[PDB]
Amino acid sequence: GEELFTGVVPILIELDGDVNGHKFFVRGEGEGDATIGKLSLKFIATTGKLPVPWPTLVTTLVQAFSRYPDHMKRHDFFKSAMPEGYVQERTIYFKDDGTYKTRAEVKFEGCTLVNRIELKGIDFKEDGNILGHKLEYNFNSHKVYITADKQNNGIKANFTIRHNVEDGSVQLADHYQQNTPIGPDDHYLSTQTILSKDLNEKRDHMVLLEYVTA
Amino acid sequence: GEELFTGVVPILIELDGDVNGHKFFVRGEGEGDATIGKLSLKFIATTGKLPVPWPTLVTTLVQAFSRYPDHMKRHDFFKSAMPEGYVQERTIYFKDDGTYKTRAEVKFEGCTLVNRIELKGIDFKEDGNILGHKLEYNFNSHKVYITADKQNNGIKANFTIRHNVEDGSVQLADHYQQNTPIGDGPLPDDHYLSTQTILSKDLNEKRDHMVLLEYVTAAGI
């Protein structure tokens, strides 16, 4: 399915989220290029100020755009699932803090790639790093190891994101991933991310850029 | 229909040309937006300096990216033919000179819109405006009158490009269009396409080329 990822591909991302009863919705549009890894998206919270800081949704808000090199093309499960797409399920444990349960389907709708996500977060501490918005507006580089899932015919991944916090400590988020096709050897995805803001935009937003290679 | 023309669409253009025996090939790539009417393309002559000046190829080298406003959406024949596409057959008469006959298939091939063109030119003067490269590297604003052709289930168009000549004269090029859908399920009253075009060059680029930017909108009604 890599046949569909040569050159720039338009992207739509919709996240239906519920953290501790706090209902919110995020829409993102942009382009992705998987020849260089470039991911460029802008997200908008159509339901007010987010109850949760933007950097925690980064891992939830398209690894199909990883810049798999010539000797690692056989291992790209993500593109190969397209245009049928795949289902991405994740469990995110914020240490000493609440937890995420995310189900995501990444599929082609026409010529555009769509990532429709449902998120549920419970047992989060108010006045803490997540609900208290104490997390820095950053996302540092992380390696994500991908392995093959023998039972369900897809891939699984686990990694720990280190969120920088304003006072100076470090907030950790343990990730557990499961990808399943709708219709690979041990390698990793090295990711870089920049977070910016659009000054003409007053709705709570996030502009991100990403470089992903394997 | 028009749904494939919301937002930026990638474009590939390939020209197989035969003018007075002088064989050439032109390849073009870029993007189009039909919400604002913007075309951004770069063409390369992969076979040496063209026997004919670039401007003469402008009209031949995807009117589907014209910016039909919401109240003239019904009249957009080009978009309605997609993704199966349409055939553009054109005859171009240069006054006191030779003539172009172009057959082109503009269709969606995957997520890219492709314009494959066959061009044949005869009876051109070696000592004239075209073969002599007397035409300036520009393209002035032109209106393209569209009427509905019910018999061929498409559209026909007539317009005349005024090509500037270096001495100060004007070379005229009479155009005659006929567009035919490749499938079925695609007819607009008399309206026109007002077009602006800039022809530029990339200094990094060693091959005979042409970079253009174009703004096409629909009006008259």
Is the domain A1-214 a CATH 1.10.1200.10 member? Answer: no
Query: What are the residue ranges spanned by the domains of chain A?
Result: 1-214
Length of chain B: 221
Chain B residues within an 8 Å CB radius of A110: 3-4
Residue A35: Cβ within 10 Å count? 12
Residues 6 or more apart whose CB falls under 8 angstroms from that of A3 comprise none
**Residue B155: both structure tokens together:** 């559209």
Chain A residues within an 8 Å CB radius of B110: 4
Q: CA gyration radius for chain B?
A: 17
Chain A residues within an 8 Å CB radius of B8: 10
Residue A137: Cβ within 10 Å count? 14
- Give yes or no for a contact between B40 and B29, defined as CB atoms under 8 angstroms apart: no
Token pair 């199909």 in the structure block, residue = A64
- Give yes or no for a contact between B94 and B170, defined as CB atoms under 8 angstroms apart: no
| CA B63 – CA B85 distance, rounded (Å) | 12
- Give yes or no for a contact between B191 and B219, defined as CB atoms under 8 angstroms apart: yes
Nearest to A59 by CA among A21, A25, A90: A90
Class of domain B1-221: mainly beta
Nearest to A23 by CA among A51, A43, A42: A51
Question: Is B10 in contact with A7 (Cβ distance < 8 A)?
Answer: yes
